Amino acid sequence: AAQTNAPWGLARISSTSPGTSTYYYDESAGQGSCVYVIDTGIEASHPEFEGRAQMVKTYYYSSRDGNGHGTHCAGTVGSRTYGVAKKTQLFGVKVLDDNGSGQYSTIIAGMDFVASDKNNRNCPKGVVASLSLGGGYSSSVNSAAARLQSSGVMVAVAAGNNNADARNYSPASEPSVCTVGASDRYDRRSSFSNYGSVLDIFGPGTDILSTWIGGSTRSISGTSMATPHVAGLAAYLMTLGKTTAASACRYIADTANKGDLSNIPFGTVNLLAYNNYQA
Ligand SMILES: [Ca+2]
Ligand SMILES: [Ca+2]
Numbered sequence: 001a002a003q004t005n006a007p008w009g010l011a012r013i014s015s016t017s018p019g020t021s022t023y024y025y026d027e028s029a030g031q032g033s034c035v036y037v038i039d040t041g042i043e044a045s046h047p048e049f050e051g052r053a054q055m056v057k058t059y060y061y062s063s064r065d066g067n068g069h070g071t072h073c074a075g076t077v078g079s080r081t082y083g084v085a086k087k088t089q090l091f092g093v094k095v096l097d098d099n100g101s102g103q104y105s106t107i108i109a110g111m112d113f114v115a116s117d118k119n120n121r122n123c124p125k126g127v128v129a130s131l132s133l134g135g136g137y138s139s140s141v142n143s144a145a146a147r148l149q150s151s152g153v154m155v156a157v158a159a160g161n162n163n164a165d166a167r168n169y170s171p172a173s174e175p176s177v178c179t180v181g182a183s184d185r186y187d188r189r190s191s192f193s194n195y196g197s198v199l200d201i202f203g204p205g206t207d208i209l210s211t212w213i214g215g216s217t218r219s220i221s222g223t224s225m226a227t228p229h230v231a232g233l234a235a236y237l238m239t240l241g242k243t244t245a246a247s248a249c250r251y252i253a254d255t256a257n258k259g260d261l262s263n264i265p266f267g268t269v270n271l272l273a274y275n276n277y278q279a
Contacts, residue, residue, distance in 0.1 A: 001024070001025050001026065001027045001029070002022050002023070002024050002025075003022065003023040003025075003081075004021065004022050005021055005022075006021065006022060006023035006081075007023075007081075007082055007208065007209045007210070008021075008185045008204065008207070009076070009185075009203070009204025009205075009208050009225075009229055010023035010082075010083075010084060010204075010229075011023050012183075012185070012204050012272070013084065013203065013204065013229055013233060013272075013273050013274055013275055014274075014275050014277050015274075016257055016260075016274070017260075018185060018186060018187045018260070019185075024275075024277045024279065025084075025086075025236065025275060025277055026236070026240060026277060028087070028236075028239050028240060029085055029086040029087035029088070029236065029239070030078065030084070030085025030086065030087050030088035030125075030232065030235040030236045030238075030239045031087035031088070031125070031239055032123070032124045032125035032239050033085065033088045033089070033123060033125040033126055033127070033128065033235035033236075033238050033239050034088065034089045034090075034091060034118070034121055034123035034126075034127045034128070034235075035074075035077045035078060035085070035088050035089070035090055035091070035127075035128040035129070035130055035231055035232065035235050036056075036091045036092075036093055036114045036117075036118075036127070036128070036129040036130070036153070037070055037073055037074040037077060037090060037091070037092055037093070037129075037130050037132075037228070038093045038095050038107070038110050038111065038114065038129055038130065038131050038133065039065075039069055039070030039073055039074070039092070039093070039094070039095070039096055039130075039131075039132055039133065040065050040066070040067040040068070040069045040070035040071075040094060040096040040097070040098065040100055041055060041058065041063055041064060041065030041066070041067075041070045041071070041092050041094035042054075042055060042065055042070050042071050042074040042090060042092035043064070043065050043071045043211070043213045043214075043215070044090075044092065045215075046071065046075070046079070046211050046213075046215055047215065048075055048079035048080050048081055048082065048083075048211045048217075049074070049075075049078070049079055049080075049090065049211070050080055052078065052087070052088065052089050052090055053074060053078070053089075053090040053091075053092065054090070054091060054092065055091075055092040055093075055094065056091045056092060056093060056117060057092075057093045057094065057110065057113050057117070058093075058094040059094060059095055059102075059106045059109065059110065060094055060097055060098075063092070063094055064098075065092070065094070065098075065213055066097075066098030066213070067096070067097075067098045067099065067100050067213070068212045068213040068218070069096070069100050069132070069224065070092060070094070070096070070132075071210075071211050071212055071213050072208075072210045072211060072212055072218070072220060072224075072225070073130060073132045073210070073224060073225070073227070073228045074090050074092065074211065074228070075210035075211030075212075075217075076208060076210045076225060076228035076229055076232060077090060077128075077130055077228040077231050077232040077235070078090050078232060078235070079210065079211050082209060082210040082211060082217070083210075083232055084228070084229055084231075084232025084233050084235075084236055085232040085233070085235040085236040085239070087239075088232070088235045088236075088239075089121075089123070091114075091117075091121070093110045093113060093114060094110075095107045095109070095110035095133070096133060102133065104135070104138055104140065104141050107133060107141060107144070108140060108141060108144040111129070111131075111144040111145060111147070111148045112144060112147065112148075114127075114129050114148060114153060115147060115148050115151035115153065118151075118152070118153060125235075125238050125239040125241075126152075126154065126235075126238040126244060126245045127152065127153045127154070127245060128153065128154040128155075128156065128231045128232075128234045128235045128238070128245065128248075129148060129153045129154070129155050129156070129231070130156050130227055130228045130230075130231035130232075131145070131155065131156065131157040131158065131171060131177075131227065132158050132222070132223070132224030132225070132227045132228060133157075133158065133171075133224070134157065134158055134160050134169050134170060134171060134172050135169065135170065136168065136169060136170065137167075137168050137169060137170050137173055138170040139170075141170040141171050141174075142170050142171055142173060142174035143174075144171070145157060145170075145171035145174045145176075145177045146174050146176045146177070148177075149176050149177050149245075149246075150176070152245050152246070153245055154178070154231070154234045154235075154238070154244075154245040154246075154248045154249070155171075155177040155178060156177070156178040156180055156227050156228075156230045156231040156234060156249070157171045157172055157174070157177050157178065157179055157180065157227060158172065158179075158180060158222070158223035158224050158226070158227045159172045159179050159180055159181045159182070159193060159194040159195070159196075159198075159199055159223045159226075160172050160194040160223055161182075161192040161193070161194070161222050161223055161224075162192070162194055163191065163192055163193065163194065163195075164194055164195075164196075165194065165195060165196035166179060166181075166194040166195065166196045166198050166199060167196050167197070167198055169194060172194065172198065173198050174198075175198060177249070178200045178201060178230060178234070178248070178249035178252070179198050179199050179200050179201075180199070180200070180201055180202065180203050180223060180226045180227045180229075180230045180273075181193040181194060181195060181199045181201070181202040181203075181205070181223060181226060181268075182202065182203065182204070182205020182206060182221070182222065182223045182225065182226040183202045183203065183204060183205060183206070183226070183261055183272060184204075184205070184206035184207070185204070185206065185207065186262075187260050187261050187262060187272070188261065188262045188263050189202070189261055189262070189263045189264055190205045190206045190221065190223075190226075191206075192221070192222070192223070193205060193223055193226075194223065195264070195265050195268040196267070196268055197267055197268070199268055199269055200249050200252075200253055200269065200271075201230055201249070201252055201253055201256060201269065201271050201272075201273050202226065202261060202269075202271060202272045202273065203226035203227070203229035203230045203233075203272070203273045204225070204226060204229055205221060205222055205223055205224075205225045205226035205229075206221045206225075207219050207220075207221055208220060208221065208225035208226075210225070229273055230252060230273050233252060233273050233275060234248040234249070234252065236275065237251065237252070237275070252273055253269065253271050255274060255276050256271035256272055256273055256274050257271070257272040257273075257274045258270060258271055260272050
């Protein structure tokens with residue numbers, strides 16, 4: 001399949017080179033996989049989700065995404081026009097309030113919730129969780145992300161927008177999950193992206209167009225936007241049978257575009273998520 005005039009990030013993850021405009025992908029598109037978006041919620045009624053999104057848990061008064069961030073990230077995972085894995089099922093877990101903020105204890109609860117809830121869902125191609133969130137280092141946040149990964153979920157987490165070493169941020173610094181830095185359309189590390197030895201991979205993160213609340217769309221930037229490219233890619237590759245939840249991060253690093261990024265500090269991987277799609 002080919003989506004013409006796709007958002008630059010979708011085009012980038014299906015090209016060895018920057019500057020293309022078509023997103024090339026296998027039509028299986030993540031069908032049969034499930035991605036939990038642990039965030040501000042998902043506006044599941046957005047036409048871009050085609051019925052494939054639903055809220056499954058909220059830690060606040062409503063399950064409505066009053067913010068947009070979670071709807072944006074969910075759209076990069078799996079919306080029709082803006083998503084990597086256009087046929088995945090999306091499950092929203094609202095751990096962040098409508099200002100985009102959330103307590104670590106609630107974030108941890110949402111991770112534990114996903115580890116259990118997946119056992120009640122039919123996700124034959126496997127389960128991913130996208131965590132476009134984070135704050136300062138917390139061993140209990142890292143342990144919760146480690147547990148979620150150990151339970152059989154491919155966990156992708158933002159590296160953080162601090163232009164600093166991700167070792168000081170969580171869940172970014174948990175080694176066992178997939179920590180995702182951000183790049184821009186010219187293959188530079190995004191100016192805000194964290195870096196460091198714990199990063200596993202970069203994905204498109206600057207000026208990413210996706211779904212927003214109110215049935216709308218908008219373009220925002222962050223490691224939050226790069227993370228769902230990787231989560232969506234994992235779901236896509238799991239549906240293809242090329243990898244598993246336990247091995248998807250390593251597989252994505254294995255198969256990434258290597259050495260294409262600029263302003264990568266020595267000791268940070270120079271790896272950009274790539275679907276290796278060949279028609
Ligand atoms: Ca290249
Ligand atoms: Ca890792």
